[PDB]
From Swiss-Prot:
It catalyses: a 1-O-alkyl-sn-glycero-3-phosphoethanolamine + H2O = a 1-O-alkyl-sn-glycero-3-phosphate + ethanolamine + H(+); a 1-acyl-sn-glycero-3-phosphoethanolamine + H2O = a 1-acyl-sn-glycero-3-phosphate + ethanolamine + H(+); 1-(9Z-octadecenoyl)-sn-glycero-3-phosphoethanolamine + H2O = 1-(9Z-octadecenoyl)-sn-glycero-3-phosphate + ethanolamine + H(+); a 1-O-alkyl-sn-glycero-3-phosphocholine + H2O = a 1-O-alkyl-sn-glycero-3-phosphate + choline + H(+). It is found in: Secreted. Its main location: secreted. The gene is Enpp2. Inhibited by vanadate. Inhibited by micromolar levels of bile salts, such as tauroursodeoxycholate. Not inhibited by taurodeoxycholate. Not inhibited by hydroxysterols, such as 7-hydroxycholesterol, testosterone, dexamethasone and prednisolone. Inhibited by EDTA and EGTA. It comes from Rattus norvegicus (Rat). This is Autotaxin. 1-hexadecanoyl-sn-glycero-3-phosphate binds at residues 159, 180, 261, 420. The nuclease-like domain is most probably catalytically inactive as residues that are essential for catalysis in the DNA/RNA non-specific endonucleases are not conserved. However, it is required for the stability of the protein and the catalytic activity born by the Phosphodiesterase domain. PANTHER family: ECTONUCLEOTIDE PYROPHOSPHATASE/PHOSPHODIESTERASE, ECTONUCLEOTIDE PYROPHOSPHATASE_PHOSPHODIESTERASE FAMILY MEMBER 2. Secreted lysophospholipase D that hydrolyzes lysophospholipids to produce the signaling molecule lysophosphatidic acid (LPA) in extracellular fluids. Its major substrate is lysophosphatidylcholine. Can also act on sphingosylphosphorylcholine producing sphingosine-1-phosphate, a modulator of cell motility. Can hydrolyze, in vitro, bis-pNPP, to some extent pNP-TMP, and barely ATP. Involved in several motility-related processes such as angiogenesis and neurite outgrowth. Acts as an angiogenic factor by stimulating migration of smooth muscle cells and microtubule formation. Its cofactor is Zn(2+); Ca(2+). Zn(2+) 2 binds at residues 261, 265, 420.
Length: 806
């Protein structure tokens, strides 16, 4: 119940939301069906439209008008945005030359530059170039301010997950808005786009910017607007709030536009009908900037123009139906569209089997336009698993396609020509970022970045301490003229041991054998040096990784590679090696095929053993430093040390062997040398974070050798590829991956073919940021470079996407 008999008199767009059953006058009252009876009359005035005209100049104030052209309007803060242009001979903001804003130029009483967020739904990154002719205001913001060629949204590339990621700095799995539609099994409640359940606070986790601001004494405008409030009224409301007394005035504001998403769904991303929505958004930007200029705030406010996701061409005919795959289609519930989520229709049905469902959906049709995954097997870059609202079974849908349960769902729900929600690496899903104001840089282009990073920057812009989030604070310092955040490197927690030769061969009873007993102070002195780290500067280019948790580990040096060997996990946490452009690939000699050698620096009790591999019929082994890339026949023996061995399913060995034998050399030739750091990852609870020992669900049979869920590699070279990786004087270039350690290659439909037809494709799908690997391993990389820490943070957030040019 709401007693709507109260009044909005002097309360229009009030900032504090009044509690029930008292009627509301705020910008969300319509959405709650709770506005006072006179809200439309008083707060949504439309008379005479939105623009001053010559004959309205100096008019007698008529309070009925939507906006004013009278002489008193500036002090009242309610002129039409074009007032000074029409009535006072001023120019529109867009017609002014841009001039660097070196310092905030603010009216007296302003304690900080306000921040205005202008968010646009469905604003695809390529609109900045493709629509440039019809968006002069936005184009001026872009060229005069700081801009990225694009900004990467989060997965799924849906509206609510992205807007709330923007607001919180969190992945959807952490903030809890994991789709536009959700079922929470603990609440036993459903979240929908239409309805009232979505208003319950329990869905919305983390701490959004408006709450962070309020808790730290920075006043915030209300970010959300009821659909029926016209854009012109939203702008006028913001401008009116900016005229409040200092003690009452917010420092942070948001405008939201439902366009171009609304039209993009109907007409496709580049439908000829899309020009008008783009023109109209630009006009709104013009109104804001003209309004700011009138208030003498155009060189004081920081403005962020930001989108949530792009838009792809998608039509009804491009729909895959689960009824063409499953016999039992009525025993499931599907969340459909540009992603699929499957669960049992009834929790009381004991015939339901996720294993048989996945199999029935796996590589069944030649051109199949979706791929099934257990959520924990999704690419780690998506960070889409650690939430009870995310169903165990997920369908990654090809761009341009839908998945639905049955054909009747599609014609009894073509209408639409556009949609979004696909993998967040997809070019059509990319969106926009422009920052303009005293705190942003002048005429500066910055590399693409992820929207999870913005919360930290918005906190910086407002002098706020950010709540704990998934951004890497400092990684976007290069966007800013001032207010940069200067982080310190995390402290190493565990110092390594440096073991020398401490064990005789015969102390080892590992069931390993090697044909290495085929035997000089000239070379014996030399190998002693190598074991003491004489080549470490070549193979460890950026310092040793820091171990940021409590553990027991050894640094092991070799001619060709260096490792940090965990006595706890019985394998390296990391293995580092450099391969020059000139390096040659060799084979594993016949006599060494099954060679495994005890490491006399490491105790039998802290070593793996070959017998466990013999006994475990499912599990084989591989090596982290590849024997194929040994610098010499004698150095090759180092590669067969038991301390370089890791457990690998035979199916995974196909992937790993191809990476190591073919791809590393290929990258070294293309990139002028590469430094490689590889290692295991253990993430059995799929939280994106390093497992402790007691979280490991699988061991090599009969042993304490834990099985990795994933294997990573970080591949670094010089950004200026005229310089070799090991002699680089400037910025670095990186690509990384986190490959799932799976007992089959079911993910790769073409895996029965030669590795050259499918392995690199798989690796590209599992591309990763160094930062993702840091979370998953508790390691901190690039500790010793000649580069600024902020630059290194940006490098650590880089994702190599393998898409063509935007
Ligand atoms: C991205 O950034 C985020 C933010 O930094 C990272 O997420 C953090 O990770 C931490 C470690 O996983 C986690 O810390 C835990 O906090 C527990 C208290 O959590 C509540 O309070 C916080 C603070 O206000 C709040 O943010 C939380 O909000 C979550 O839950 C609510 C409702 O459930 C949701 O609305 C909200 O969306 C959010 O959900 C997300 O996180 C939860 C986990 O909290 C997931 O379950 C969801 O799926 C979703 O992703 C909470 O309201 C605290 O109790 C924990 O301490 C326990 O666990 C450790 C064991 O390791 C132990 O030391 C403690 O003693 C204690 O153990 C006891 O409980 C165990 C479990 O029941 C039990 O097994 C034991 O026997 C003990 O009884 C823990 O410290 C932190 O909450 C989240 N924060 C957020 C916002 O998600 C994230 O990791 C980053 N991602 C990457 C890839 O880097
Ligand atoms: C801090 C980063 C800012 C991101 C940022 C900026 C602006 C918004 N605003 C909106 O999304 C909006 O107005 N939606 C209208 C429908 N609403 C649906 C949800 N229940 C209220 C009505 C959100 C996030
Ligand atoms: Ca984990
Ligand atoms: Cl969804
Ligand atoms: K085996
Ligand atoms: Na052997
Ligand atoms: Na396969
Ligand atoms: Zn949409």
């Amino acid at each position: 119940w709401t007693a709507t008999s109260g009044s909005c008199k002097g309360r229009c767009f009030e900032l504090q939301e009044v509690g029930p059953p008292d009627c509301r006058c705020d910008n969300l009252c319509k959405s709650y069906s709770s506005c006072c009876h006179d809200f439309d009359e008083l707060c949504l005035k439309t008379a005479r439209g939105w623009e001053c005209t010559k004959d309205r100049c100096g008019e007698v104030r008529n309070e009925e008008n939507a906006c004013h052209c009278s002489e008193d309007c500036l002090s009242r803060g309610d002129c039409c945005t074009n007032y000074q242009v029409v009535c006072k001979g001023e120019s529109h903001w867009v017609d002014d030359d841009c001039e660097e804003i070196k310092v905030p130029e603010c009216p007296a009483g302003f304690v900080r530059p306000p921040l205005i967020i202008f968010s646009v739904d469905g604003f695809r990154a390529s609109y900045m170039k493709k629509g440039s002719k019809v968006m002069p205001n936005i184009e001026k913001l872009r060229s005069c301010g700081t801009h990225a060629p694009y900004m990467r949204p989060v997965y799924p590339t849906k509206t609510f997950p992205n807007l709330y990621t923007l607001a919180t700095g969190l992945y959807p799995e952490s903030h809890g808005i994991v789709g536009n539609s959700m079922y929470d099994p603990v609440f036993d409640a459903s979240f929908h786009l239409r309805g009232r359940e979505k208003f319950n606070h329990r869905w919305w986790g983390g701490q959004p910017l408006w709450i962070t601001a309020t808790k730290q004494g920075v006043r915030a405008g209300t970010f959300f607007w009821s659909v029926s409030i016209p854009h012109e009224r939203r702008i006028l409301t913001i401008l009116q709030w900016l005229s409040l007394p200092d003690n009452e005035r917010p420092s942070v504001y948001a405008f939201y536009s439902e366009q171009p998403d609304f039209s993009g769904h109907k007409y496709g991303p580049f439908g000829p009908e899309m020009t008008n929505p783009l023109r109209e958004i630009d006009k709104t930007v013009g109104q804001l900037m003209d309004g700011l200029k009138q208030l003498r705030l155009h060189r004081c406010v920081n403005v962020i123009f930001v989108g949530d996701h792009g838009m792809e061409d998608v039509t009804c005919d491009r729909t895959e139906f689960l009824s063409n795959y499953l016999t039992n289609v009525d025993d499931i519930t599907l969340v459909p569209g540009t992603l699929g989520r499957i669960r049992a229709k009834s929790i009381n049905n004991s015939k339901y089997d996720p294993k048989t469902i996945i199999a029935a959906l796996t590589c069944k049709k030649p051109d199949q336009h979706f791929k099934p995954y257990m959520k924990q097997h999704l690419p780690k870059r998506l960070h889409y698993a650690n939430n009870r609202r995310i169903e165990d079974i997920h369908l990654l849908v090809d761009r341009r396609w839908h998945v639905a349960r049955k054909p009747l769902d599609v014609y009894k729900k073509c209408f639409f020509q556009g949609d979004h929600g696909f993998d967040n690496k997809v070019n059509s899903m990319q969106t926009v970022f422009v920052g303009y104001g005293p705190t942003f840089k002048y005429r500066t282009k910055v590399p693409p970045f992820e929207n999870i990073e913005l919360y930290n920057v918005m906190c910086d812009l407002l002098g706020l301490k950010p709540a704990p989030n998934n951004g890497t604070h400092g990684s976007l310092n290069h966007l800013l003229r001032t207010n940069t955040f200067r982080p310190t490197m995390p402290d190493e927690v565990s110092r390594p041991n440096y073991p020398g030769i401490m064990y005789l061969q015969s102390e080892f009873d590992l069931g390993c054998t090697c044909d290495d007993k085929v035997e000089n102070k000239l070379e014996e002195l030399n190998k002693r040096l190598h074991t003491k780290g004489s080549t470490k500067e070549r193979h460890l280019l950026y310092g040793r990784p820091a171990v940021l948790y409590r553990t027991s580990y050894d640094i092991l040096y070799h001619t060709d590679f260096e490792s940090g060997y965990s006595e706890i996990f019985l394998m390296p946490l990391w293995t580092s090696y450099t391969i020059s452009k000139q390096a040659e690939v060799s084979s594993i000699p016949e006599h060494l095929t099954n060679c495994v050698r005890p490491d006399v620096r490491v105790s039998p009790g802290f070593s793996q053993n070959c017998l466990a591999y013999k006994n475990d019929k499912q599990m084989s082994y591989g090596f982290l430093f590849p024997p194929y890339l040994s610098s010499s026949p004698e150095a090759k023996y180092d590669a067969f040390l038991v301390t370089n061995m890791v457990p690998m399913y035979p199916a995974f060995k196909r992937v790993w062997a191809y990476f190591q034998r073919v791809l590393v050399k290929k990258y070294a030739s293309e990139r002028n040398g590469v430094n490689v750091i590889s290692g295991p990852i253990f993430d059995y609870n799929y939280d994106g974070l390093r497992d402790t020992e007691d979280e490991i669900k699988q061991y090599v049979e009969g042993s304490s050798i834990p099985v990795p869920t994933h294997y990573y590699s970080i591949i670094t070279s010089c950004l200026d590829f005229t310089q070799p990786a090991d002699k680089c004087d400037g910025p670095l270039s990186v690509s990384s991956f986190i490959l799932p350690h799976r007992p089959d290659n079911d993910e790769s439909c073409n895996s029965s073919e030669d590795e050259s037809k499918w392995v690199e494709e798989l690796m590209k799908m599992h591309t990763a940021r160094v930062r993702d690997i840091e979370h998953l391993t508790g390691l901190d990389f690039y500790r010793k470079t000649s580069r600024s820490y902020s630059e290194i943070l940006t490098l650590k957030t880089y994702l190599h996407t393998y898409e063509s040019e935007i």
